[PDB]
């Protein structure tokens, strides 16, 4: 049987439609019939799925030779981010690029970001049409996407980029973002207009970033703390070569896209969940009074860390809504399941879904319930029991006895996690100070999840009520 093949009704299209609408149900159904191993092919390819912590570990801590990350994602991502970065290079190069970024994301940089982020959010609320007036409704995703783009560009991308978003960067991003179109799952190369727009934006962004850098050199200065003034200096690879401006530009673009899509989606889910749960939001608010005090002094890198429930709300949301549902590798050499008869072959993709474990009864009783309090068992912005293996950058716990891996594990694990927590936690705390949220009358629960795009996000246009506090 090799790995059980998934009984479907058509060639090529296979089960993909089933996948596309909802993978998790799809995976679960598959699980029920076939257990922890499946095979369905989506589009062209045979994607082999290993569920379970072991399923997770196998693929995520899979051997460098045996599974390849870039061959799967490079075409799609590479046109977008640019050449030579992320997946446009051998793994070793990737590891050094992660190193530079993680280098640029130390606590003292993180500290520097918090005031900037609180400033952008507070400025947005004051100056934006979104929250004008005491009581109102607003478009969550649109509103939240703007906030995350402002907060990340000010802190991480820096002043010039932030300034640009006022002019010309908004459209560029939107155009570039078309590179993540579902047809681009198959046809990234083809010169459809949207692809031609994508290529046009990518070039233009690169020219801009490069001019920003060159201008900095021209004055040969520094001032705080963006990954930019950081990649200028964290120039050098082991070979002794400093990172070229173009690479810096393409790295920034990658970080921009990555952070924005992940942040905006997650942040959206947080606002949506909170709207459903006025009790939690008040508790969050009550936490700030209790822990920071009645005065509600300004949020800092230090005092944020006390927001245990805020931390929990993010964790709980990540558990159910994290935008990445499927992690995929290209099988380079046939691989032996430690357990079983099945052998996984080269014509195959391997797909792991930590979200599944994430929403399993064994691992999480009543998993589908969005309850932050379930975490009263533990909290880690940084986690847990397993071994730490250093690949390049730092010392990453590939640890995989954890059912909960929103940020992945092994050599491909997120280096943006701390930043993401900082950003989300900060945005959440501010909003909680400023607002109450309710559902529109007669509206219960939350919209559905749209898995059609590479990242997943709330489906429709969802409005929710906002009430201000003073
Ligand atoms: C909630 C937000 C985020 C989530 C859920 C998230 C999730 C993940 C996941 C699951 C992976 C591993 C995927 C794989 O092995 O292919 C990953 C890797 C990564 N993430 Fe994130 N991420 C988030 C935010 C960010 C941010 C803000 C950045 C940049 C600032 C970032 C940059 C990266 C990078 C560079 C990798 C490396 C992937 C690789 O080496 O192949 N992420 N992220
Ligand atoms: C490849 C992509 C992905 N992988 C698997 N399933 C869905 C997906 F969107 C992703 O892992 C998403 N991601 C990672 N951190 C934030 N977002 C990724 C990683 C690094 C990056 F530089 C850009 C980027 F999109």
From TrEMBL:
Protein name: sterol 14alpha-demethylase
Binding locations of heme: 414
Sorted UniProt keywords: Heme, Iron, Membrane, Metal-binding, Methyltransferase, Monooxygenase, Oxidoreductase, Transferase, Transmembrane, Transmembrane helix
Gene: cyp51B
Domain of life of the native organism: Eukaryota
Topology in the lipid bilayer: Single-pass membrane protein
A Gene Ontology BP annotation from the UniProt entry: methylation
Subcellular location: Membrane
Cited SUPFAM superfamilies: Cytochrome P450
Gene Ontology terms: cellular component: membrane
Cofactor(s) for this UniProt protein: heme
Primary localisation category: membrane
Keyword Transferase annotated: yes
Organism, scientific name: Aspergillus fumigatus (Neosartorya fumigata)
Functional summary from the UniProt entry: As a target of azole drugs, plays a crucial role in azole susceptibility.
């Amino acid at each position: 049987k090799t790995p059980p093949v998934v009984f479907h009704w058509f060639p090529f299209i296979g089960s993909t439609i089933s996948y596309g609408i909802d993978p998790y149900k799809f995976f679960f159904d598959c699980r029920a019939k076939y257990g922890d191993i499946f095979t369905f092919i989506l589009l062209g390819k045979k994607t082999t799925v290993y569920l379970g912590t072991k399923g997770n570990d196998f693929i995520l801590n899979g051997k460098l030779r045996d599974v390849c990350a870039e061959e799967v994602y490079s075409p799609l991502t590479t046109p977008v981010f640019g050449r030579h970065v992320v997946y446009d290079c051998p793994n070793a190069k990737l590891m050094e690029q992660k190193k530079f970024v993680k280098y640029g994301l130390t606590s003292d940089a993180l500290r520097s970001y918090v005031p900037l982020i609180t400033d952008e959010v507070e400025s947005f609320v004051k100056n934006s049409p979104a929250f004008q007036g005491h009581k109102g409704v607003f478009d969550v995703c649109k509103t939240i996407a703007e906030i995350t783009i402002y907060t990340a560009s000010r802190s991480l991308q820096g002043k010039e980029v932030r300034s640009k978003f006022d002019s010309t960067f908004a459209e560029l991003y939107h155009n570039l973002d078309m590179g993540f179109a579902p047809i681009n799952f198959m046809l990234p190369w083809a010169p459809l207009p949207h692809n031609r727009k994508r290529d046009a934006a990518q070039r233009k962004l690169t020219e801009t970033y490069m001019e920003i850098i060159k201008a900095r050199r021209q004055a040969g200065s520094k001032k705080d703390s963006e990954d930019m003034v950081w990649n200028l200096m964290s120039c050098v690879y082991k070979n002794g070569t400093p990172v070229p401006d173009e690479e810096i530009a393409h790295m920034m673009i990658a970080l921009l896209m990555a952070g924005q899509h992940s942040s905006s989606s997650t942040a959206s889910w947080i606002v949506l969940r909170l709207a459903t749960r006025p009790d939690i939001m008040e508790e969050l608010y009550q936490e700030q009074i209790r822990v920071l005090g009645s005065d509600l002094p300004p949020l800092t890198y230090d005092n944020l860390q006390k927001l245990d429930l805020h931390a929990k709300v993010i964790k709980e949301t990540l558990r159910l809504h994290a935008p990445i549902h499927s992690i995929i590798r290209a099988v380079k050499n046939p691989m032996a399941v430690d357990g079983t008869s099945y052998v996984i072959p080269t014509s195959h993709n391997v797909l792991s879904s930590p979200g599944v474990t994430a929403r399993s009864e064994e691992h999480f009783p009543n998993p589908l319930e969005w309850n932050p309090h379930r975490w009263d068992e533990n909290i880690a912005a940084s986690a847990e029991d397993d071994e730490k293996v250093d690949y390049g950058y730092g010392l990453v716990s590939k640890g995989t006895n954890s059912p909960y891996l929103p940020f992945g594990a092994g050599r491909h694990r997120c280096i943006g996690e701390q930043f993401a927590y900082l950003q989300l936690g900060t945005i959440t705390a501010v909003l909680v100070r400023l607002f109450r949220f309710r559902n529109l009358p007669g509206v219960d629960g939350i919209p559905d999840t749209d898995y059609s795009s590479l990242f997943s996000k709330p489906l429709g246009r969802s409005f929710v009520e906002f009430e201000k506090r003073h």
